[PDB]
Design an enzyme around this catalytic site. Structure first.
Site, PDB file in Angstrom:
ATOM      1  N   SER A 155       0.822  -1.216   0.000  1.00  9.91           N
ATOM      2  CA  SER A 155       0.000   0.000   0.000  1.00  9.91           C
ATOM      3  C   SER A 155       0.857   1.268   0.000  1.00  9.91           C
ATOM      4  O   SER A 155       1.601   1.484  -0.961  1.00  9.91           O
ATOM      5  CB  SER A 155      -1.024  -0.026   1.149  1.00  9.91           C
TER       6      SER A 155
ATOM      7  N   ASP B 225      -8.429  -2.576  -6.820  1.00  2.64           N
ATOM      8  CA  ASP B 225      -7.936  -2.371  -5.461  1.00  2.64           C
ATOM      9  C   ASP B 225      -8.949  -1.595  -4.613  1.00  2.64           C
ATOM     10  O   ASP B 225      -9.515  -0.589  -5.057  1.00  2.64           O
ATOM     11  CB  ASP B 225      -6.593  -1.640  -5.522  1.00  2.64           C
TER      12      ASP B 225
ATOM     13  N   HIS C   4      -6.805  -5.862  -1.274  1.00  2.00           N
ATOM     14  CA  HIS C   4      -5.844  -4.814  -0.926  1.00  2.00           C
ATOM     15  C   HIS C   4      -4.668  -5.463  -0.207  1.00  2.00           C
ATOM     16  O   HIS C   4      -4.874  -6.105   0.827  1.00  2.00           O
ATOM     17  CB  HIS C   4      -6.510  -3.755  -0.035  1.00  2.00           C
TER      18      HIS C   4
HETATM   19  N1  LIG Z   1      -2.244   2.620   2.470  1.00  3.09           N
HETATM   20  C1  LIG Z   1      -3.053   2.926   1.298  1.00  3.09           C
HETATM   21  C2  LIG Z   1      -2.494   4.145   0.561  1.00  3.09           C
HETATM   22  C3  LIG Z   1      -2.784   4.558  -0.732  1.00  3.09           C
HETATM   23  C4  LIG Z   1      -2.048   5.715  -0.966  1.00  3.09           C
HETATM   24  C5  LIG Z   1      -2.010   6.457  -2.141  1.00  3.09           C
HETATM   25  C6  LIG Z   1      -0.775   6.806  -2.671  1.00  3.09           C
HETATM   26  C7  LIG Z   1      -0.693   7.534  -3.848  1.00  3.09           C
HETATM   27  C8  LIG Z   1      -1.857   7.914  -4.502  1.00  3.09           C
HETATM   28  C9  LIG Z   1      -3.093   7.558  -3.982  1.00  3.09           C
HETATM   29  C10 LIG Z   1      -3.172   6.830  -2.803  1.00  3.09           C
HETATM   30  N2  LIG Z   1      -1.350   5.976   0.125  1.00  3.09           N
HETATM   31  O1  LIG Z   1      -1.616   5.027   1.065  1.00  3.09           O
END
Ligand SMILES: [NH3+]Cc1cc(-c2ccccc2)no1
Ligand SMILES: *[C@@H]1O[C@H](CO)[C@@H](O)[C@H](O)[C@H]1NC(C)=O
EC number: 3.1.1.98
Length: 350
Positions: A145, A252, A296
């Site tokens: 993530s 996701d 996820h």
């Molecule tokens: N732990 C989940 C998560 C997703 C993101 C994330 C990172 C970049 C763009 C959009 C979302 N950052 O953390």
């Protein structure tokens, strides 16, 4: 079990100024090292960081960390659970900077919180070099993530660090799990007035609040004020020099959350278009694993061995990647589902 070590350089800290750290299980015979970055969203202003500190404090502080952790999935030392790298040296780096591993800012009279994710990675690598990493042949920087996005942001900087320190023979590689997101149109819309803020606007604000850092070649392409572009995998991946294997569920749950999705024709077409767009961005990524599932994360889940694409499991694909870095008959490395709906792959997690 992996054992906790707090960083000896106490100026490299979690959000609240407590020392950052890492958990380590050594494997004396092995010259392979796995450094895993934990995930868990982020915070981007005083008010939503204060909320995260009340009820997600282990992601903001080391004060309550346990002395050991059990290695699971790709961090397991049992070949039955980890067919890929069970004999490697194992490192788990906790996520306590809330900055998608991008920050370089200390707590001070002008900053309630420290955001030091980029500096935490660099300091862990140092201190490990005195514990056996100096003898490594491969350093795999992995993460899930927010940690998967962190791999994309930091893998080339680790490679540059080791070159300048005099270790040109260590091969640095990346494994990014569930960190490949799209800045696509949302299914329902809201202006950024925490819950309503789209990731493009939240990350633009965060970079400024964290003093966030992105890879140099990507920074040069997009330039000042547009560094948020480099947090999106399909934009930053083409700028990287290190080999990177990309693991990404086509549907996701975090992507659907930021798209304001929680089935009639409008939503059916939206979901099918999301899967097609993700598949399009992976078309020319030669090391990738992308099943048509609603889920996820995967690589530190104990049952990560169960999912398959075209009959090949993820541990097998990673082994095939290793061989390719020494095409291979019956041992593929690019594995992307073509079926267009969640759980059209029978091996999806339940
Ligand atoms: N732990 C989940 C998560 C997703 C993101 C994330 C990172 C970049 C763009 C959009 C979302 N950052 O953390
Ligand atoms: C400690 O970490 C800080 C922040 O990255 C760095 O500037 C400093 O050089 C480090 N000190 C030592 C002795 O490594």
């Amino acid at each position: 079990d992996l054992r906790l070590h707090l960083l000896l350089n106490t100026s490299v800290t979690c959000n609240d100024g407590s020392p950052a750290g890492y958990y380590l299980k050594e494997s004396r015979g092995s010259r392979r090292w796995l450094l895993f970055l934990e995930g868990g969203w982020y915070c981007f202003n005083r008010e939503n960081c204060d909320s995260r500190y009340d009820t997600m404090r282990r992601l903001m502080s080391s004060r309550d960390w346990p002395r050991t952790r059990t290695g699971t999935g790709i961090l397991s030392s049992q070949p039955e659970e980890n067919p890929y790298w069970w004999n490697a040296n194992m490192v788990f780096i906790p996520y306590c900077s809330s900055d998608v591993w991008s920050g370089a800012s200390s707590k001070s009279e002008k900053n309630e919180y420290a955001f030091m994710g980029a500096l935490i990675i660099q300091e862990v690598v140092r201190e490990l070099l005195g514990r056996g990493l100096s003898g490594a042949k491969v350093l795999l920087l992995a993460g899930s993530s927010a940690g998967g996005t962190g791999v994309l942001l930091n893998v080339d900087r680790v490679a540059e660090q080791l070159e300048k320190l005099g270790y040109p023979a260590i091969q640095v590689r990346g494994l990014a799990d569930s960190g490949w997101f799209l800045d696509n149109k949302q299914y329902r819309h809201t202006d950024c007035v925490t819950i309503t803020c789209a990731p493009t606007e939240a990350i633009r604000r965060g970079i400024r609040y964290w003093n966030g850092v992105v890879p140099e070649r990507c920074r040069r392409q997009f330039q000042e004020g547009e560094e948020w572009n480099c947090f999106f995998g399909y934009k930053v991946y083409p700028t990287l020099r290190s080999p990177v294997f990309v693991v990404q569920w086509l549907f996701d749950e975090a992507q659907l959350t930021v798209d304001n999705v929680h089935v009639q024709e409008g939503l059916r077409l939206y979901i099918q278009n999301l899967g097609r767009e993700l598949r399009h961005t992976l078309k020319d990524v030669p090391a990738s694993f992308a099943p048509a599932c609603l889920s996820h994360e995967i690589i530190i889940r104990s049952h990560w061995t169960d999912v398959q694409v075209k009959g090949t499991s993820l541990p097998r694909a990673l082994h095939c990647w290793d061989r390719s870095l020494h095409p291979l008959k019956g041992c593929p490395v690019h594995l992307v589902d073509s079926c267009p709906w969640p759980h059209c792959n029978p091996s999806c997690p339940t």
